[PDB]
Each structure stands twice: as structure tokens, then as C-alpha cells.
Design a protein around this ligand. Sequence first.
Ligand SMILES: CCc1cc(O)c(F)cc1-c1cc(N[C@@H](C)CO)c2nc(N)ncc2c1
Length: 289
Amino acid sequence: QFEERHLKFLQQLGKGNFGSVEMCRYDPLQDNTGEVVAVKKLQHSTEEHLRDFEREIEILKSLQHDNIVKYKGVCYSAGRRNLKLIMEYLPYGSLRDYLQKHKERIDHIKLLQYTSQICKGMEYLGTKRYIHRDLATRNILVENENRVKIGDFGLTKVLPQDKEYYKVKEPGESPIFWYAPESLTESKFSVASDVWSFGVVLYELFTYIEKSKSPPAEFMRMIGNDKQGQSIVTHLIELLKNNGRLPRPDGCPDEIYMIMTECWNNNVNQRPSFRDLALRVDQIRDNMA
Ligand SMILES: CCc1cc(O)c(F)cc1-c1cc(N[C@@H](C)CO)c2nc(N)ncc2c1
């Protein structure tokens, strides 16, 4: 158990789904020798978001994989309504920030190593019947130059026993530029819609997070920058239905763009599996190395 009185605030790490992440030192000996941890807390500790946060905690606790952020514990000290989630602190930050800082200094071999690691964490997630729903480089963390881990399980849903999809009745904030067409039209999330988002993550990696090339900038340019609010969703659905897709990033290998376009299939059943994606990406890495 982690006592709040010993959790020393060090710095703000960012905002996750429905909360804030802080870098803290868990220092029970009060000599500044304690472990540095990442702590998620709720900004608005309501009954609905406390229920989702408790589910996120249970989901993360059940996951043990090299490419999934490690759960460490929970801090109850501030009562049952003010829970804190304690996770390992990944010192190189989000993959989005890491790539935007180093750009083309991260070679293609290195990008494919991270791609393979993302596939493996996601494939492991699917064996548990969890649908991440928010796969993006902003939610992927860098442990060191050789390892990335999937983070932010805030939107993660568990598939019902008798269904291959989860229908979200009243959506909250939704990362629509990473969404599969059926997630936009019917609010249906499955392993197949996570594969669609994975194709978007692969696109983010090979654009090196060049601002004007981001999935929102590119899709807005395709539907027209004059579209606003709900109209964006309406026009994005029509664009995807008519095979409007993100372009091939400048300098991206043909083989890598072929994977992205296969992930972006309107037919749910034709999208590749994460097992097949990790095998294909590993073969590509082997053909390069
Ligand atoms: C949103 C909190 C959270 C919840 C989860 O369910 C989860 F699996 C991971 C995280 C999380 C998130 C961070 N940063 C966020 C700002 C980027 O999305 C972390 N940043 C660093 N450097 N280290 C570890 C971090 C762990």
C-alpha cells in the first residue's frame, strides 16, 4: 500500500483521459531516496468518472507485458472517492514527444522496432478481450531508446462474453481522427477498430509528428477547414466511405504504407490481426537488418 503523506509531488506530466498525471517521489523514509512514480488522479471525482477510473485500475492491474505500462498500486489515503493510480514512471516521455524532438534521427529500423512492440502489447490486450479505444502516439510511452509501452487505458472497454464488439451509448470526448468508420457511424469498438487506429499510429510514426501532417490536419484539409463541430464527423464518415485516406508519409517505405492501408479497410473482417502484423513487421525488420 502507498500512503498519500509520503507521495511527494515533483512535476506535472500531462493530461490523460478524464484526469491528470504527475511525477511523484514515493518517499516513506523522507530522505529523497524514494522511487519516482507516475500518478494519475481525477480532476472531477464524480460517481461516473470514479466508476470508469476504478475499471481502468482493474484493467491495468490484470495486464503483465513488456510493452504495457506497469501498474504499481493505488493510494486510498484521501478516501474512496479520491483514488490515485500509481504506475511506473517512463523517463523518456510519450512517443509523440520523443519523436517530435528527435525527428529523422530515429531511423526506419528503430521505428519498426517500436511498431513491432506496439503490435505485441495490443495482441496481448486482445487475448484479454480488452478494446483500447485510444491507441495514438500521445498514449504510447518510451522507457528507453529500445522499448515503448502502451499507456492511457482510460477509454478501454471489455468485450461482452457473447459479442466481438462494444457499443458506447453516450460518447464522451472521442479521438475521431483515429476512429474506424463503424466507430464513427455506430459507436462500435472491437479488436478490428483498434487495428484501424494502429494504422493511424504507424502513419504518425513515419510523419515524425510533422505538425501540418498530423491526422487532424490532413483529414480537415480533405473535408475542408470550413467544417466545424458535428459537421466534421458527418463529412469524415462520407470521406472514409469513399476511400479518402491519409497520404503516404514523405520517405515512408512502400511496404509500410501497404500495412497502413490494409489496417484502414472499410470491411472490418478484412483488417489484419495484431498477431499477423507483429510477424509482418518483424520480417520487414529482418529484411533490413
Ligand atoms: C493517463 C495516466 C496513465 C494511465 C494508464 O492507464 C496508463 F496505462 C498509463 C498512464 C501514464 C501516462 C503518462 N503520461 C500521459 C500524459 C501520456 O498520455 C505517463 N507518463 C510517463 N512519463 N510515465 C508514465 C505514464 C503513465
